[PDB]
Structures are given as structure tokens and as C-alpha cells.
From Swiss-Prot, chains A, B:
It catalyses: RX + glutathione = an S-substituted glutathione + a halide anion + H(+); prostaglandin A2 + glutathione = prostaglandin A2-S-(R)-glutathione; prostaglandin J2 + glutathione = prostaglandin J2-S-(R)-glutathione; prostaglandin J2 + glutathione = prostaglandin J2-S-(S)-glutathione. Glutathione binds at Y6, W7, R42, S43, Q44, W45, K49, N58, L59, Q71, S72. The gene is Gstm1. InterPro entries: Glutathione-S-Trfase_C-like, Glutathione-S-Trfase_C_sf, Glutathione_S-Trfase_N, GST_C, GST_mu, GST_superfamily, Thioredoxin-like_sf. Conjugation of reduced glutathione to a wide number of exogenous and endogenous hydrophobic electrophiles. The olfactory GST may be crucial for the acuity of the olfactory process. Participates in the formation of novel hepoxilin regioisomers. Residues 1-87 form the GST N-terminal domain. Its EC number is 2.5.1.18. It is found in: Cytoplasm. This is Glutathione S-transferase Mu 1. Belongs to the GST superfamily. Mu family. Homodimer or heterodimer. It comes from Rattus norvegicus (Rat). The modification Phosphoserine is found at S66, S204, S209. It comes from the Eukaryota. The keyword Phosphoprotein applies.
Length: 217, 217
């Protein structure tokens, strides 16, 4: 079958695990483990990093037949074209492009705060930024069921992931944005997703490696 | 015409400026200025950030009639679809997807170093990593004329950009990689690109904003 390689953490791979399940893909995962302090051994991965035939070795990676992919975004796009989950019109392609990129920005901001020493120091004023962030997602979605338009597309997986994580970090961040709470419920409600969330393969936490100062266990 | 907005710096908008030129697009630019230390005034931009009808306001932005786009990669993809500068087969689409994302990673690494107050003590370690990055690109391109195949695509613009920047940072980083030097020479040899490089509109440095520790002047 297909192989998905990544750390045994949620990280930036929730989107991909969710889509593999949504599309009924025949897959197996390799979940590499990092060592505990002081050093935090990464050898399980390092030992084969440069032996997989990957062009730009990294985690996550996807092996599908003779195809070998890296870059989480690229994996998502690959799967999308494979299972017809892309925007159909120009308006839909545009919305998809922006959200994909925007999610990435929001993800990096989070990691930056969380992989900061005085994690506790910032959270305050960081929770300060959440509303305007959420408001932008809210207004962009509006009354549509999915982010690109009339059908579910790969970007809803990305948007589900980030809205979920901010929801973890700041549990009240969504009270002011009902269409966002409804979108989380609608996504969580897709048949194949619901079933996966009760499964043994489900890995909602931790999000970051023991390394961070939040969701690190 | 089309309107492109961004800082009066190279930053991450070079690929867009180059593609606008390559496609013979009618466009105008707004090059926003930042004040120097210690406050580094951003009002020129802050004064209209929320007044352009953008969904997730940011720099760069592209306004094209009714269409308003943010996120540098979505701006690139929009120009590529309009101008048929995308891959035509699954193989080309994969290679483009990988490269678009790899670029961003390598770009982010440069920035993290360049905005670090510890730049000078930091630099030696960064320098050590250059050869490995360059090798990956070299081996990926191989004997192909362009990154995604036998034809120029929008990813050549991003690759060009990042390889040039690393070459500026460390002049000898391409010596070991002839195919890389040749790619730089070939890209710069395109009729609309040589022409632009001599125009009043060309901006190659400063690379970063005034906050930076290098190429910030
Ligand atoms: N993911 C976005 C990130 C865009 C972004 O962060 N824009 C920055 C400038 S880019 C910045 C940069 N610079 O300006 O010197 C250069 C850079 N680079 O060389 O790669 C990276 C930057 N960055 O902050 O990410 C900005 O000031 N936005 C306006 C706002 O927040 O109100 C994109 O690709 O467009
Ligand atoms: N742009 C690449 C980034 C891949 C990357 O940096 N991979 C990290 C893990 S992701 C890391 C992360 N984490 O592992 O907890 C979580 C994260 N996130 O939650 O957003 C971001 C990560 N990061 O370092 O960028 C890694 O360990 N690569 C193997 C190597 O360097 O040899 C992609 O989208 O796939």
C-alpha cells in the first residue's frame, strides 16, 4: 500500500491522515519516535533519512507506488488530484490557494509562540491576536458550507486542522463565530471522519514534540 | 491595470515582479516604506491595510480588476494559470508542488538567521548547512533545462530567486554545482528578464527590511 512517514505527533500532518481516511486509501504509517531529554534522539529517522529515494528528504513523506513525495502541501495536492478534490472553477482555485497558504502562516505563528522559552509570557498577548485571526476566517467562509465553494476540497482538511488547534490553545476563541463552530461540526460529521475519530489510528494529541511548552505530551 | 503592493525591498516578491515582466502584464506597483530603528514606522501600509477589500490583508497583494489576492504563492499560481505556465502532466505538477514548498522552507531558514540579534555568532553554523541544500537542488534539476521539465513554469521563478539570494549571502556556494550556475545563466537569458534587469523597475537589494541584520540597507 501507500506509506505515510512522520513523527508520532499531530504536528502538521493531521490534514494528510484525515484525507487518506476520507478517500478510503490503502495505507500504512511509519510513526518515528524521538528520544527524551537531554539530547532528544532523532536517530530512528536519521538512520534512513537519505535511504528512501526522496528528492528533498523530510517529514512528512508519502510513498505511493513509484511516486515519492515530501512537503505536506505537495502531499495534500497530490491526493487532491488523485481523488478529484480540487476547486473546479477559477474562483474555487483562488480561494483554495489563499487558504492553503494562509493556514501555513497561522501554523508557523503558533509553533513560534509554543517553541519559545517564555511560552507562558506570550500566550497572553498572543490570545490577543486570535479574534482578528478568527474573524478573518469567519468572514471569508460566510454562509458557504465549505471553504472553496459547493463541494468539500482538500483545503477544508487544512482549515479544519488549524481551527481545531487554535480551539485547543484558546478554548473560548470561537464563541463569537458560529459559522466556524458549525464548520468544525460539519467536518467532524463526514461519515469517514467520524469513524476514524473513534478508531485506534486517531492521534489528536500531543501536537508538538516534548520540545515545545504546550501540547507537548 | 493590475496593482502589486509590497515593501520597497526584494524580500519574497521578486518571483512575482519577474513573472509580471515575463508575461508582458500591464501592472503598476506600490512600494511601501518602513521607518528606521528604533520604531521602524509601518504607517504607510497600516494606513490602508484594512481598506483594500482583501480577504486576509497582507503584503504582497495583487489587485486584478475584481480579483484581490494575498499570499505570494497564490499570486504566483494565479498568474501561472492565466498564462499557461503550469505543469501539463501529473509528473510536472508534482515536481512543481515540491519545489514551490522547498523554496519557502529554504527562504524561512535565511530569514530566521537574518532577523536574529545573534546573527554574527549564528552565521558560522548556518554557513555549514549551505552545501547540503545546494546539492539537493542540483541533483533534483539534474540535466533538465527547467525545474518541472522541458518547459519553463512558474516554479523556475521561485527557484531562481532563492538560488540567487543564497549566492549573494555566500558567493562560492554554487562553485561545486555547474548545472545550478547554468540554470541561473539561462533564466537571466530569457528576453523579457534580461530587459527588466536593466530597467528602472529592477530591485535586487536590499533583500530584507530595516529590522534585518544583513542586506537590510
Ligand atoms: N506567507 C505570506 C507571508 C507574507 C508576509 O508575512 N508579509 C510580510 C512581509 S514579507 C517578510 C519580508 N520582508 O518584508 O522583508 C521578507 C521575507 N523574505 O525575505 O522571505 C519574509 C517575510 N516575512 O515576514 O515572512 C508583511 O509585512 N506583511 C504585512 C502585514 O503583516 O501587515 C506570503 O508568502 O505572502
Ligand atoms: N515545509 C515542510 C516542513 C517539514 C518539516 O520541517 N518537518 C519537521 C517536522 S514538522 C515540525 C513540527 N513537529 O514535528 O512538531 C510541527 C510543526 N507544526 O505543528 O506546524 C511544524 C514543524 N516544523 O519544524 O516546521 C521534521 O522533523 N523534518 C525532518 C527533518 O528535518 O529531517 C512540510 O510542509 O512538509
Amino acid at each position: 500500500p501507500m506509506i505515510l512517514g512522520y513523527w508520532n505527533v499531530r504536528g502538521l500532518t493531521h490534514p494528510i491522515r484525515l484525507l487518506l481516511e476520507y478517500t478510503d486509501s490503502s495505507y500504512e504509517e511509519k510513526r518515528y519516535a524521538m528520544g527524551d531529554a537531554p539530547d532528544y534522539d532523532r536517530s530512528q529517522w536519521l538512520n534512513e533519512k537519505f535511504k528512501l529515494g526522496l528528492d528533498f528528504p523530510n517529514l512528512p513523506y508519502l510513498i505511493d507506488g513509484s511516486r515519492k513525495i515530501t512537503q505536506s502541501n505537495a502531499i495534500m495536492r497530490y491526493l487532491a488530484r488523485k481523488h478529484h478534490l480540487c476547486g473546479e472553477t477559477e474562483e474555487e482555485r483562488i480561494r483554495a490557494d489563499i487558504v492553503e497558504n494562509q493556514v501555513m502562516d497561522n501554523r508557523m505563528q503558533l509553533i513560534m509562540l509554543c517553541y519559545n522559552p517564555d511560552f507562558e509570557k506570550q500566550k497572553p498577548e498572543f490570545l490577543k491576536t486570535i479574534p482578528e485571526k478568527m474573524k478573518l476566517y469567519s468572514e471569508f467562509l460566510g454562509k458557504r458550507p465549505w471553504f472553496a465553494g459547493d463541494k468539500v476540497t482538500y483545503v477544508d482538511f487544512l482549515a479544519y486542522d488549524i481551527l481545531d488547534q487554535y480551539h485547543i490553545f484558546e478554548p473560548k476563541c470561537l464563541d463569537a463565530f458560529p459559522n466556524l463552530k458549525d464548520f468544525l461540526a460539519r467536518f467532524e460529521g463526514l461519515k469517514k471522519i467520524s469513524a476514524y475519530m473513534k478508531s485506534s489510528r486517531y492521534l489528536s494529541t500531543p501536537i508538538f514534540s516534548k520540545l515545545a511548552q504546550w501540547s507537548n505530551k
